[PDB]
Structure 1
Amino acid sequence: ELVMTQTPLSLPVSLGDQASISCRSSQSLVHSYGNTFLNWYLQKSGQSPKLLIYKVSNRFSGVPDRFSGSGSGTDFTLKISRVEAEDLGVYFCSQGTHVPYTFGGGTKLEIKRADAAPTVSIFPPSSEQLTSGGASVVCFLNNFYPKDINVKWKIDGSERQNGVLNSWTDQDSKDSTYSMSSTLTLTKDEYERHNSYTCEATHKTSTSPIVKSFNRNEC
């Protein structure tokens, strides 16, 4: 069927700047005179896709003029002019000329902003979890930029790699930062025969790593 090739995969852009997103189809999308059914969508984090541009260049009801679309031959372009923080998410082209309808692979728009170091917090296992024979240690690393970050667990000074599970948020539509959670899970047995637990983060903002720690005896 009709392959839609969308580029780039990600698009970092400063506020006020213009972003340009391309889709190329493998054949003409002209359905009939005055009808080329190429659509553009935005899917924000945690939401369904919303229609921005229909029939190549037509702005959907409610969409600002900051958003425009064009296309000649099999080449189509979405432009987002005065980029706002709320514009972040994944942009998709789709064609409705030929069945099966098909979509591009998406473009993730990333808002550029000033570097910001993570706010780091560490959490011992709850007494509730301990009663069950497990022990999870959690570390939040919140509101940082850029999204690249490296987190290390250390137990009594020794690096621990096994038993770690990490998750990142999508970029924040208000402050343009990222957040990350790291959970180290061990048995209650192991937990209770070590003392010092450390969450250590290196980020481009700092030469020295940000360290958060507790000792099992003190708390």
Structure 2
Amino acid sequence: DIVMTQTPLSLPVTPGEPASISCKSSQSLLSSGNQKNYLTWYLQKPGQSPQLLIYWASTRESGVPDRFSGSGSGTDFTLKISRVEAEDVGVYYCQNDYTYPLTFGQGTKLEIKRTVAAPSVFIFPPSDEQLKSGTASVVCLLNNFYPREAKVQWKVDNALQSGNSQESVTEQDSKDSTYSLSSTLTLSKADYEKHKVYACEVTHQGLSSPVTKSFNRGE
């Protein structure tokens, strides 16, 4: 296979500014027959099918705004957006369309750049209703933060956890360009009641030091 490597993986962009996404192929996509580069760019908007942007490295598909342009040769290619619009958010993929198999790049997420916002960190003990049924879900909420990158570790009686929590992140908020994150720790009722202190440790750019939100079980 030809490997298609995109840089960067994540691209924060202030609407109105230019953006560029690089795509490197492991082998040349330039045909000796016609001197065309068989490189294609797609955009996949949130919850939608992918859309064709550019083919033959530099030819815009009909209906694609002129702010989108492609350049490059052989193994190195660049998608440029001259002036980014809010509706340009999503994941951009390059594709080898020179030789089978028709491999995609890993994708570059274009997101709205805004001022750094530290998460508001909230912790929820399991409901009495859930505990009665025999399970304890402990939810740590990181609300309205930017950027997306965050580290959440669970500590139970100062013992670091692993393999018993799951994370979910919302798509970038349409109004304020922030993210929210849930970390849910799942224990059986018996395992839950063996321990006192339940702590969510949060690392984020907006926080000067790692932050711990905690409760004592039964309080």
What residue is the counterpart of 2:204 in the other structure? 203
Aligned to 1:89: 90
Query: Could you tell me which residue of structure 2 aligns to residue 116 of structure 1?
Result: 117
Q: Quick one: distance in 1 between partners of 2:158 and 2:2?
A: 54
Partner of 1:51: 52
2:65 equivalent in structure 1? 64
Please name the residue that 1:8 is paired with: 8
Partner residue of 2:146?
Answer: 145
Query: Residues 37 and 73 of structure 2 are in contact (CA less than 8 Å); yes or no, is this contact kept in structure 1?
Result: no
With 30-39 and 9-18 compared, the bigger mean Cα shift is at 30-39
User: Which residues of structure 1 form unaligned runs of 5+?
Assistant: none
Paired letter, 2:79: L
Judging changes above 3 Å, is the alpha-carbon distance between structure 1 residues 206 and 65 closer, same or farther for their aligned structure 2 residues?
same
Separation of aligned partners in 2, 1:160 and 1:68 = 49
Deviation for aligned residue 1:167 = 1.5
Matching residue of 1:130: 131
Letter paired with 1:87: D
Change (3 A) 1:159 1:67: same
> By how many angstroms is 1:66 displaced?
1.8
Once structures 1 and 2 are overlaid, which stretch shifts more, 14-23 or 164-173?
A: 164-173
Q: How does 1:142-181 map to 2 (within 5 A)?
A: 142-155=143-156, 158-162=158-162, 164-169=164-169, 171-172=171-172, 174=174, 175-181=176-182
Check whether the contact 1:110–1:171 (CA below 8 A) recurs between aligned residues: no
SS in 1 for 2:133: coil
Contact 2:72 2:78 in 1 (8 A): yes
Aligned residues: 217
Q: Once superposed, which parts of structure 1, at least 4 consecutive aligned residues long, lie more than 6 Å away?
A: none
Letter in 2 for 1:39: T
Q: Relative to structure 2, which stretch is displaced further, 136-145 or 18-27?
A: 18-27
For 1:100 and 1:208, locate their aligned partners in 2 and report how far apart those are by CA, in whole Å: 47
Distance in 1 separating the partners of 2:12 and 2:178: 13
Aligned AA (2:6) = Q
The aligned amino acid for 1:97 is Y
Question: What is the CA–CA distance in structure 2 between the aligned matches of 1:45 and 1:134, rounded to whole Å?
Answer: 34
Q: Select between 121-130 and 26-35 the one with higher mean Cα deviation.
A: 26-35
| Sequence identity percentage | 63
Q: Distance in 2 between matches of 1:202 and 1:4?
A: 32
Letter in 2 for 1:40: W
Whole-Å separation in 2 of the counterparts to 1:122 and 1:70? 49
Q: Distance in 1 between matches of 2:43 and 2:94?
A: 9
- Kindly state the Cα deviation for residue 62 of structure 1 after the two structures are TM-superposed: 3.4
Out of 29-38 and 168-177, give the one that drifted further: 29-38
Structure 1 letter corresponding to 2:188 = T
- Would the alpha carbon gap of residues 75 and 211 (structure 1) be closer, same or farther in structure 2, given more than 3 Å must change? closer
Any stretches of 5+ residues in structure 2 without a counterpart? none
* Contact 2:111 2:172 survives alignment (8 Å): no
Kindly state the Cα deviation for residue 136 of structure 1 after the two structures are TM-superposed.
1.3
Task: Tell me the C-alpha RMSD between the 2 structures.
Answer: 3.2
Deviations 1:113-163 (A, max 9, x none): 1011213332222344323322111111122112333434455x6355246
Q: Is the 8 A contact 1:163 1:186 kept in 2?
A: no
Q: Is the 8 A contact 1:85 1:173 kept in 2?
A: no
